């Protein structure tokens, strides 16, 4: 009868960086879209 | 009638040459001090970002 499991342990939510379609609209908004993706990843890591 | 006229005549070439050089110098200055000024305008990406924030997104 050895250790079974750490109920405390939780697998961290693996975040995937959001991808935008490569159009001219993306190039004009490249910086803005990148900021949204960074915000999305930060929200996923922290939770909200 | 004789002397002052002769010396004026002798002066003429050097003065003409120097004045031509002076005019060239001034036009050279005109072109030297011309530079093309490229202005910088606020990037519209920040405007788009502020618009998004105002939406509460």
> Looking up tokens 């060239």, which residue turns up?
B24
Name the structure determination technique.
cryo-EM
In the Cβ-directed half-sphere of B25, how many Cα atoms lie within 13 Å?
6
- Give the distance from CA B17 to its chain's centroid: 24
Query: The tokens of B54 are what?
Result: 């105002």
Backbone φ and ψ of B48, nearest 5°: -65, -40
Instruction: Report the length, in residues, of chain A.
Output: 48
The terminus-to-terminus CA distance of chain A in angstroms comes to 40
User: Does A29 contact B45 at a Cβ distance shorter than 8 Å?
Assistant: yes
User: Does A35 contact B48 at a Cβ distance shorter than 8 Å?
Assistant: no
Q: Which residue of A has its CA nearest to B48?
A: A32
The terminus-to-terminus CA distance of chain B in angstroms comes to 97
- Give the distance from CA B30 to its chain's centroid: 4
Residues of A in contact with B55 (CB under 8 A): none
For an interface test with B, give the residue of A28, A31, A32, A36 to mutate (most B CBs within 10 A). Answer: A32
Q: H/E element holding A45?
A: helix A30-46
3-state secondary structure chain B: CCHHHHHHHHHHHHHHHHHHHHHHHHHHHHHHCCCCCCCCCCCHHHHHHHHHHHCCC
For A29, which DSSP code? T
Residues 6+ apart with CB under 8 A from A41: A15, A17
């Amino acid at each position: 009868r050895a250790d079974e499991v750490d109920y405390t342990n939780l697998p961290a939510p693996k975040p995937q960086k959001t991808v935008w379609d490569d159009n001219i609209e993306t190039e004009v908004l490249r910086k803005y879209l990148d900021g949204l993706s960074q915000y999305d990843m930060e929200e996923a890591k922290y939770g909200v | 009638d004789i002397m002052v006229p002769s010396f004026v005549y002798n002066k003429l070439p050097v003065i003409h040459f120097l004045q031509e050089k002076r005019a060239e110098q001034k036009l050279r200055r005109v072109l030297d001090e011309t530079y093309t000024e490229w202005t910088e305008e606020l990037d519209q990406a920040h405007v788009t970002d502020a618009i998004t924030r105002s939406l509460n997104i």
